[PDB]
Design a protein around this ligand. Sequence first.
Ligand SMILES: CCn1c(-c2cc(N3CCN(C4CC4)CC3)cnc2[C@H](C)OC)c2c3cc(ccc31)-c1csc(n1)C[C@H](NC(=O)[C@H]1[C@@H]3COC[C@@H]31)C(=O)N1CCC[C@H](N1)C(=O)OCC(C)(C)C2
Ligand SMILES: CCn1c(-c2cc(N3CCN(C4CC4)CC3)cnc2[C@H](C)OC)c2c3cc(ccc31)-c1csc(n1)C[C@H](NC(=O)[C@H]1[C@@H]3COC[C@@H]31)C(=O)N1CCC[C@H](N1)C(=O)OCC(C)(C)C2
Ligand SMILES: Nc1nc2c(ncn2[C@@H]2O[C@H](COP(=O)(O)OP(=O)(O)O)[C@@H](O)[C@H]2O)c(=O)[nH]1
Ligand SMILES: Nc1nc2c(ncn2[C@@H]2O[C@H](COP(=O)(O)OP(=O)(O)O)[C@@H](O)[C@H]2O)c(=O)[nH]1
Ligand SMILES: [Mg+2]
Ligand SMILES: [Mg+2]
Lengths: 163, 163, 168, 169
Amino acid sequence: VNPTVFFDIAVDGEPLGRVSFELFADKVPKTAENFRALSTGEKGFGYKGSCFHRIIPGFMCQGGDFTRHNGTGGKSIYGEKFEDENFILKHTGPGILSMANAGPNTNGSQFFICTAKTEWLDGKHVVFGKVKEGMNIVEAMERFGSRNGKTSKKITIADCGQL
Amino acid sequence: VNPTVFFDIAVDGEPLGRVSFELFADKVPKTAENFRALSTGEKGFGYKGSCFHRIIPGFMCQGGDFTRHNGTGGKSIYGEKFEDENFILKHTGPGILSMANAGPNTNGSQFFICTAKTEWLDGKHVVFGKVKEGMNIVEAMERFGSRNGKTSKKITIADCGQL
Amino acid sequence: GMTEYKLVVVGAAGVGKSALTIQLIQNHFVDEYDPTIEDSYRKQVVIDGETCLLDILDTAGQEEYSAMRDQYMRTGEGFLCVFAINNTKSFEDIHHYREQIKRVKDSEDVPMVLVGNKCDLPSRTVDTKQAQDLARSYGIPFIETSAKTRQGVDDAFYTLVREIRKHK
Amino acid sequence: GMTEYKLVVVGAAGVGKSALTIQLIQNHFVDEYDPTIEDSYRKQVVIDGETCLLDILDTAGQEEYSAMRDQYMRTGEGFLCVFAINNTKSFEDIHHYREQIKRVKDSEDVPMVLVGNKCDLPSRTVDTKQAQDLARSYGIPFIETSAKTRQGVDDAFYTLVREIRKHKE
Ligand SMILES: CCn1c(-c2cc(N3CCN(C4CC4)CC3)cnc2[C@H](C)OC)c2c3cc(ccc31)-c1csc(n1)C[C@H](NC(=O)[C@H]1[C@@H]3COC[C@@H]31)C(=O)N1CCC[C@H](N1)C(=O)OCC(C)(C)C2
Ligand SMILES: CCn1c(-c2cc(N3CCN(C4CC4)CC3)cnc2[C@H](C)OC)c2c3cc(ccc31)-c1csc(n1)C[C@H](NC(=O)[C@H]1[C@@H]3COC[C@@H]31)C(=O)N1CCC[C@H](N1)C(=O)OCC(C)(C)C2
Ligand SMILES: Nc1nc2c(ncn2[C@@H]2O[C@H](COP(=O)(O)OP(=O)(O)O)[C@@H](O)[C@H]2O)c(=O)[nH]1
Ligand SMILES: Nc1nc2c(ncn2[C@@H]2O[C@H](COP(=O)(O)OP(=O)(O)O)[C@@H](O)[C@H]2O)c(=O)[nH]1
Ligand SMILES: [Mg+2]
Ligand SMILES: [Mg+2]
């Protein structure tokens, strides 16, 4: 059964709400497992305490850099980066959860949540889940983004785990 | 005789360098004294610990809000506000130290340091000092400004006093 | 993809341009006076069933810089022309903003909306009939707002989007 | 009131546009890869004895967005066309940027400077001669730079300002 994980989001340390994701282990098992384990922190490291560093209204919310906390870092549970598993699933609309990268086969821990359809990313970013509850939390994060993605407040994953 | 005060500037807590100012008490004694006492903190409050909230390269660096720390506050040693003493001195070039305000006779603690001539402020802002040493530090502060003045790093008056 | 609309909030200093914009974008009222140099905001909204992206330019009303408006007027698609109901001078200044926009854009039908802000205050000095008349001339809508109570905030920005739609 | 010059830094992803610009503005070398969406910077400088204000647009080289460059090309007064001397593909992309800028401005006479970056690296694949020839054919200056060592960083931006001043008299 596809696992479910949650983020408790805070804004400048003030609680905002919880968002939960279905991870498509049935179609991308290796990529879902990476996100799952990073959400539980069971490898000794993961998303807890990291921030969404790039939020662009009309497009997406991006985060996941827990190694450098400056938008350039993050790592997977398989080593620093791992290959593109597949591109079966498409960026079909709001709530799609997908891997950020710096070119082919550079998946780490950074991810993004679509707030709209982003079809021009299909085949270049590995889609591996979707928001299951709390899309309105993601929408609420948009109001702290900007045109180039810089945020006006600190949007953190205050807690996370598996449901 | 004109007193000399200093600011020790820090960037995200890292020391940058010292700016010193001659205060023109020989032309604006009330305004010079305000800035002097606020730089020593001898009245119980002042600039120590406050930030430069607005840095616009090519024009000026502005600070002085030690009451609200958001660019809207500040106070004088005479009360919440005091009158424009006179406009004898002009914004003649880099290094000029002058009072910020929100219209006539609304001087508090906010000030700006010019990095270029700003002659269109003449007769509207009270000029009361000039950089004596450390103009290179004011220029270095411009590294972290922007077009609308929002700073990309926290620029603080880590220490300050009289010389 | 969704359409982008470039909106520009103009008007005299202190009339509430940022108070209205921050209410729209962040859903809270700034009671303190933080005069603007220049700021930009983005919000996706649904107006009449169409999703769209609002790009909002929050401008400075200081008269020292009135000669520097042409560039943002050329680039903007529609303009929220704000005065304050208790400030006669700001209503007077509204005329020059309109004339300056028409002048710069060389058109009588630039998407535009007249906004009478601070409508929660007592001691109004500019009553609705002269604002209504001024709006009847020009040929544009007029909306009374309060950025303190949030009254008319959404309507003001959404109406301006509807004007750009009618034009284009 | 000093003159403002609107400079735009263009080139393929990862050639060092931001590294060069941050070196100029902040005297700091960005060791890490922080891909740009769009950033703007300001710096006042003295060039040939004349103080002026540089307004720098730092752009994104990702090819998916190549059709969205028209707006910034219409507004820019001069263009830093950057490639990396160890990336032949980025050198091949230059021609695309130049043709695009000429098309958008509808002019054969647009201030540009060709910049070969990363000249500190030993794995050079683009000959200095080959870059000089291209710049000669275009009629523009060519400067080799290193954002890491700061070699040529000031020179590249200052030369671009000189190219603009020549187009302005
Ligand atoms: C030209 C402007 N411009 C736009 C854009 C585009 C559009 N549309 C495009 C689509 N059209 C439709 C067919 C009609 C209409 C016009 C409108 N307005 C804009 C913006 C707001 O104008 C300022 C973008 C965009 C994106 C990039 C650079 C410039 C961009 C860019 C740089 S790097 C990257 N993209 C991949 C990046 N990699 C890393 O972050 C690496 C870091 C280091 O290694 C780990 C880590 C990554 O994986 N993501 C995860 C996924 C979304 C992605 N970031 C991102 O942020 O895209 C943002 C955005 C807004 C979706 C696209
Ligand atoms: C139109 C853009 N634009 C410019 C400007 C202008 C120019 N030139 C104009 C002159 N031309 C030459 C003769 C021909 C050439 C083109 C170029 N580019 C720009 C900028 C970068 O484009 C984004 C400015 C400027 C200034 C304001 C608003 C908009 C502005 C503004 C708002 S409030 C104020 N100014 C006074 C303010 N009050 C408070 O902060 C109050 C807060 C509440 O109560 C306590 C506290 C205050 O006292 N100061 C202390 C003093 C400098 C001053 N701030 C400030 O920051 O000005 C900055 C700036 C850049 C110097 C001027
Ligand atoms: N009572 C009231 N005050 C307002 C309203 N809008 C703005 N203000 C106040 O008017 C002052 C100026 O607002 P501001 O948005 O900064 O003016 P701007 O220069 O036009 O951006 C602030 O103190 C605001 O709190 C309003 O709708 N009602
Ligand atoms: N050795 C070296 N590395 C550089 C140089 N310039 C940039 N880099 C590196 O190249 C990578 C990409 O640089 P960046 O400025 O982000 O590329 P951009 O997409 O053109 O902005 C970064 O890791 C930089 O540290 C350089 O002159 N020398
Ligand atoms: Mg404002
Ligand atoms: Mg870059």
